[PDB]
Amino acid sequence: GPLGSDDVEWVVGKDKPTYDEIFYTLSPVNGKITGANAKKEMVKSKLPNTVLGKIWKLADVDKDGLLDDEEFALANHLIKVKLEGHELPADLPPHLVPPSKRRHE
């Protein structure tokens, strides 16, 4: 049975180009920045340290400790949501979880 492609609306796909540029300015080592790079970026965002921890713990879907361009873009996306006056529901739904981390079966 030929199953179809599940294309969910990952809004970060609209955000990506901008955070991709930022990702490159933090010096992406082997295509993935370390916790230090994004840590100083997060403190530049001028958010409370508690928020940084929450943003990271949600955004880092790999639980790898590093942020690649999609994880980092989610990090920035969530930070922006906070800056917009709102907050993240502490839920990663299908339309926020990147396809790279979408578990099939």
Binding site: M42, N49, G53, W56, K57
Partner: peptide, 15 residues
């Protein structure tokens, strides 16, 4: 295992 060491904003609390 509850202290998540993968977060640079969660790197140790008081000690």
């Amino acid at each position: 295992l509850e202290s998540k060491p993968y977060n640079p904003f969660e790197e140790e609390e008081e000690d």
